[PDB]
């Protein structure tokens, strides 16, 4: 039944396995340094995290 | 071994240098030989993102920066002295790491 | 929905024993960060929690991919009227006051 | 841009309902009318199930799902 | 106001309904009886079939369970209380079973003791 279907051929590159930790959005993800935010949420929270504009 | 290292990391240089000077002064108040503060190359974290939430307008980007400054001071003293000098009501942001290696 | 009654009573003693909880919306994924290894299937526990907090009589607030709950006394009254468990057995949450 | 236009086959479907009769006539019978009766199903020699696991009957490869056992003479 | 079989039978059947379990379906009930997991099972016959009665009584004697003849199971269906959802609903109950301990597990009752003593004598 359930085990006859699940976990048969590995999906090693799941885009749908990742989401923004603030709004749970699929797109515009920033996985660098482990932010795991979408780019809009990062722009909203960039100053609080510690990233600030200099150049 | 009696070689103990303290590694100081913060995103700003004012507080990190203040803490470094404080700890050097503290280790020199007692008669202790101290290896001068050694500065790592201050790795810079960059995140460049489109400014727009949509995909409209002139392609404009934000260039976000985050610089991490790393200093390590070497001196020879037991753990009690290090624990006492750590409890100094430290200023925020300067992450202190001590290793007995 | 699609929830059996044994899992219903399981989630109900969970609500009785905890009271104040934090959680995250997870359904499909088979291992859970902080509410797994409960000897009960993850999906049915989380769907029963969905029934608890979305049936229409206890309010919620969904933000930052996490859940924080105020469990009103109307829900407690509903529980006492249904299962006939008096509040004389106070929750152990009233320690370290 | 158009619609998916999924209409050319099966405009309407009826739910399948298994006419599982409530009476014990097809599934089991006694054919004795006495206290002791004969069982119409072969004994299961496997120890991987319970002591009351009784197998159903098909044309071959009696299907239970838990074992998928088939009588073979090796 | 009175103490008898039905007064506690209705309550025990309703509590068995409440605490899930329940041997539902044509399967999982005969299998449960043949596995000897439970030690109580109530059966009824208000239709014209003596063969089922004979078979179930033969099984009961095989398991050393004395059949208890109860009349007017409609009395149980009308005294138990059948509120269910909303203002409507009357799901009749014919088969009575209680897994793990015959009386119940959430409470301790002397009805089990008196029933067992009546069966024993």
UniProtKB/Swiss-Prot annotation, chain A:
Gene3D superfamilies in UniProt: 30s Ribosomal Protein S14, Chain N
Membrane-spanning residues: none
Organism of this sequence: Homo sapiens (Human)
Function in brief: Component of the small ribosomal subunit. The ribosome is a large ribonucleoprotein complex responsible for the synthesis of proteins in the cell.
Annotated positions of the Phosphoserine modification: 8
Domain of life where this protein originates: Eukaryota
UniProt GO molecular function: structural constituent of ribosome; zinc ion binding
Family: Belongs to the universal ribosomal protein uS14 family.
Modified residues (N6-acetyllysine): 47
Cofactor: Zn(2+)
Manner of cofactor binding, per the entry note: Binds 1 zinc ion per subunit.
Listed name of the protein: Small ribosomal subunit protein uS14
Location of Omega-N-methylarginine modifications: 11
Major location (coarse): cytoplasm
GO BP annotations, alphabetical order: cytoplasmic translation; translation
Record's GO cellular component terms: cytoplasm; cytoplasmic side of rough endoplasmic reticulum membrane; cytosol; cytosolic small ribosomal subunit; extracellular exosome; focal adhesion; nucleoplasm; ribosome
Compartments, record wording: Cytoplasm, Cytosol; Cytoplasm; Rough endoplasmic reticulum
Curated annotation (Swiss-Prot), chain B:
Keyword Ubl conjugation applies: yes
Subcellular location(s) of the protein: Cytoplasm
GO molecular function, one term: structural constituent of ribosome
One GO term describing the cellular component: synapse
UniProt keyword Ribosomal protein, yes or no: yes
N6-acetyllysine found at: 18, 59
GO biological process, one term: translation
Domain of life, per lineage: Eukaryota
Modification note: Polyubiquitinated by ZNF598 via 'Lys-63'-linked ubiquitin chains when a ribosome has stalled, initiating the ribosome quality control (RQC) pathway to degrade the potentially detrimental aberrant nascent polypeptide. Deubiquitinated by OTUD3 and USP21, antagonizing ZNF598 activity. Ufmylated by UFL1.
Principal location listed in the UniProt entry: cytoplasm
Annotated positions of the Phosphoserine modification: 77
Keywords (A to Z) from UniProt: Acetylation, Cytoplasm, Isopeptide bond, Phosphoprotein, Ribonucleoprotein, Ribosomal protein, Ubl conjugation
Membership in a protein family: Belongs to the universal ribosomal protein uS10 family.
Function description: Component of the small ribosomal subunit. The ribosome is a large ribonucleoprotein complex responsible for the synthesis of proteins in the cell.
Subunit: Component of the 40S small ribosomal subunit.
Protein name: Small ribosomal subunit protein uS10
Organism of origin: Homo sapiens
Highest classification ranks of the organism: Eukaryota, Metazoa, Chordata, Craniata, Vertebrata
Gene name, Swiss-Prot/TrEMBL: RPS20
UniProtKB/Swiss-Prot annotation, chain D:
Modifications made to the protein after synthesis: Monoubiquitinated at Lys-30 and Lys-36 by RNF25 in response to ribosome collisions (ribosome stalling): ubiquitination promotes subsequent activation of RNF14, leading to EEF1A1 ubiquitination and degradation and rescue of stalled ribosomes. Deubiquitination at Lys-36 by USP16 is required for maturation of the 40S ribosomal complex.
Top-level taxon of the source organism: Eukaryota
Record region (Disordered): 1-18
Localization in the cell: Cytoplasm; Nucleus, Nucleolus
Phenotype upon changing residue 36 to R: Abolished monoubiquitination by RNF25, leading to impaired ability to rescue stalled ribosomes. Abolished deubiquitination by USP16, without affecting maturation of the 40S ribosomal complex
In-chain residues carrying the UniProt-annotated modification N6-acetyllysine: 27, 36
Glycyl lysine isopeptide (Lys-Gly) (interchain with G-Cter in ubiquitin), cross-linked positions: 30, 36
Zinc finger boundaries on the chain: C4-type: 44-67
Subunit structure: Part of the 40S ribosomal subunit. Part of the small subunit (SSU) processome, composed of more than 70 proteins and the RNA chaperone small nucleolar RNA (snoRNA) U3.
Task performed by this protein: Component of the 40S subunit of the ribosome. Part of the small subunit (SSU) processome, first precursor of the small eukaryotic ribosomal subunit. During the assembly of the SSU processome in the nucleolus, many ribosome biogenesis factors, an RNA chaperone and ribosomal proteins associate with the nascent pre-rRNA and work in concert to generate RNA folding, modifications, rearrangements and cleavage as well as targeted degradation of pre-ribosomal RNA by the RNA exosome.
Gene: RPS27A
Curated annotation (Swiss-Prot), chain E:
GO cellular component: cytoplasm; cytosol; cytosolic ribosome; cytosolic small ribosomal subunit; Golgi apparatus; intracellular membrane-bounded organelle; membrane; nucleolus
Modified residues (N6-succinyllysine): 120
Main location: cytoplasm
Location within or outside the cell: Cytoplasm; Nucleus, Nucleolus
Single biological process term from Gene Ontology: maintenance of translational fidelity
InterPro entries linked to this entry: Ribosomal_eL30-like_sf (IPR029064), Ribosomal_eL8/eL30/eS12/Gad45 (IPR004038), Ribosomal_eS12 (IPR000530), Ribosomal_eS12_CS (IPR047860)
Gene3D superfamilies xrefs: 3.30.1330.30
Superkingdom, taxonomy of origin: Eukaryota
Keywords: Acetylation, Cytoplasm, Nucleus, Ribonucleoprotein, Ribosomal protein
PROSITE patterns referenced in this protein's UniProt entry, alphabetically: RIBOSOMAL_S12E
A molecular function (GO) term: RNA binding
Keyword Iron: no
Pfam families, per database record: Ribosomal_L7Ae
Family under the similarity heading: Belongs to the eukaryotic ribosomal protein eS12 family.
Main function: Part of the small subunit (SSU) processome, first precursor of the small eukaryotic ribosomal subunit. During the assembly of the SSU processome in the nucleolus, many ribosome biogenesis factors, an RNA chaperone and ribosomal proteins associate with the nascent pre-rRNA and work in concert to generate RNA folding, modifications, rearrangements and cleavage as well as targeted degradation of pre-ribosomal RNA by the RNA exosome. Subunit of the 40S ribosomal complex.
Assembly, per entry: Part of the small subunit (SSU) processome, composed of more than 70 proteins and the RNA chaperone small nucleolar RNA (snoRNA) U3. Subunit of the 40S ribosomal complex.
Protein name as catalogued: Small ribosomal subunit protein eS12
Gene that produces this protein: RPS12
